[PDB]
Design a protein around this ligand. Structure first.
Ligand SMILES: [Cl-]
Ligand SMILES: [Cl-]
Ligand SMILES: [Cl-]
Ligand SMILES: [Cl-]
Ligand SMILES: [Cl-]
Lengths: 167, 167
């Protein structure tokens, strides 16, 4: 169990976000066309999981775009923008500014992902949503960076997260 | 279980939709501000449950408004607009101008409701979403009308629903 903050209140987050060195667990999440997508179909690539409570709450489009562009400019990298938003809402966010290698995935029917990756908000009003977090997974499916953002509405340390992909 | 259609492909819907003459079961769902709300909140009213696979896809906001308008104009009536969309998406669909007596309610952390009410899509691409359905409940919690819509992307029999409400 972890504690982050929202609206000046403690928020319980289940289990533990994997620390660098951890084997990244398998998952299935849902793509914009409602097909199932697995961690395993990104074999060989490094993966940046940008995880949000929602893409309709608290997030600025232009911020997320800029990170997405910096991330996908790094060699052999895919960004997985993950939230409990249905796929239809994640597609409004991504409108017609989808760059290469930025892939939206929903946890709406794969809640076990949030447990496994230690991002399941367990209480308060955001209960059932993903906490704000960034997990970077290497080409061998080992986590090489993670941040569970302590204040849920603030921005993750995107710089530290990408620095790891240079090495 | 039940069978409806989506893209002319059968879609399995769990359990059974409440039948005419049955008592409506208690539920909790989430309002636009992330508070929980119960069926008990509407004690004394007639309730029209307008149940969607999504509000963000293949639904016409303008046509839903006309129905909401007609329904809410019947005395002692509330329309509960229910989906698995997050409350944030439902609040976009709704606008700053969604009338009184139309409450948006999300099932995203209350999956049991869709099972209880016989509207949980159990397979194919829409798995995890609510089937298209209308359930009318009278002031004494009796289901007086219900429709599980055979073709998911078509409109419910609203006229029939308003008639049972006016009767
Ligand atoms: Cl996998
Ligand atoms: Cl932090
Ligand atoms: Cl952010
Ligand atoms: Cl209740
Ligand atoms: Cl029908």
């Amino acid at each position: 169990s972890q504690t982050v903050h929202f609206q000046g209140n403690p928020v319980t987050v289940a289990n533990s976000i994997p620390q660098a060195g951890s084997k990244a667990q398998t998952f299935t999440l849902v793509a914009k066309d409602l097909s199932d997508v697995t961690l395993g179909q990104f074999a060989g690539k490094r993966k940046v999981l940008n995880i949000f409570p929602s893409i309709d709450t608290g997030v600025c489009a232009a911020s997320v775009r800029k990170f997405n562009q910096l991330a996908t400019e790094i060699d052999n990298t895919v960004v997985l923008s993950i939230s409990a938003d249905l796929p239809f809402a994640q597609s409004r966010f991504s409108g017609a500014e989808g760059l290469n290698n930025v892939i939206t995935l929903s946890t709406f029917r794969n809640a076990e992902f949030l447990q496994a990756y230690g991002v399941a908000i367990a209480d308060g009003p955001l209960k059932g949503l993903a906490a704000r977090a960034v997990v970077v997974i290497d080409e061998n499916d080992n986590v090489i960076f993670s941040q569970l953002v302590d204040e849920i509405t603030t921005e993750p340390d995107y710089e530290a997260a990408l620095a790891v992909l240079k090495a």
